[PDB]
Amino acid sequence: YPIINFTTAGATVQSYTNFIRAVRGRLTVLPNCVGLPINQRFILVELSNHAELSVTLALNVCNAYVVGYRAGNSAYFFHPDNQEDAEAITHLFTDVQNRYTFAFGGNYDRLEQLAGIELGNGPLEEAISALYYYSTGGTQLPTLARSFIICIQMISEAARFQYIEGEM
């Protein structure tokens, strides 16, 4: 899948804006993804911060939302909303050693619930480490949730919004 890169290290309003445009440039907002070959159903967003930690988010091209991610040798996926997506996510991060699918979904209402939230470069920097260390036992679920929310609002939601105002 196409890979968009972004780092919080030396981040500018400009580097961030181009990042979002890039994402938006690959969306195909439709009621739900179907007809799209799984080959191009997702965008991969590689995020890295000042500690040089990197995680890769898998975004659904139809609605821009995060369906899962990769941190090093492990991958995590939100409980798919149905069977098509269930089988779809099996195509993501295939060379990864550890695969896990959460029992809960990745909608805002669930994440808010699990979280028990300032946005910005600072919070994203920290959200990236949280996502990374989750895979080694250093991140508690509530923090993981708050971190997903930060990634989702600053990336998924930002691209959707611009896509829409783009359609006037």
Residue type at position 5: N
Exposed/middle/buried for residue 64 (C-beta within 10 Å: 0-12, 13-18, 19+): buried
Q: Report, as residue numbers or ranges, the catalytic residues.
A: 65, 108, 157, 160
Q: Please give the DSSP secondary-structure letter assigned to residue 10.
A: T
How large is the angle between the packed helices 141-151 and 121-134, nearest 10 degrees?
130
> Which secondary structure element, helix H or strand E, spans residue 160, and what is its range?
helix 157-166
Q: Please give the DSSP secondary-structure letter assigned to residue 138.
A: -
Which residue from 137, 118, 20 is spatially nearest to 71, judged by alpha carbons? 137
Distance between CA atoms of 14 and 11, rounded to whole angstroms?
8
Q: Give the method used.
A: X-ray
User: Per the annotation, does 5 bind a ligand?
Assistant: yes
Residue 78 Cα to chain centre, angstroms? 11
Contact in structure between 138 and 114 (CB atoms under 8 Å): no
Which residue from 76, 60, 53, 117 is spatially nearest to 68, judged by alpha carbons? 76
Q: After which residues is the chain broken (C to N over 2.5 A)?
A: 116
Query: 60: which strand partners?
Result: 42
DSSP symbols for 91-136: GSSTT-SEEEE-SS--SHHHHHHHT----SHHHHHHHHHHHHHHTT
Q: Please give the DSSP secondary-structure letter assigned to residue 13.
A: H
User: Per the annotation, does 126 bind a ligand?
Assistant: yes
User: Per the annotation, does 38 bind a ligand?
Assistant: no
User: Per the annotation, does 10 bind a ligand?
Assistant: yes
Q: Please give the domain boundaries of the chain with CATH numbers for all domains.
A: 1-168 (3.40.420.10)
Give the resolution to one decimal, in Å: 2.2
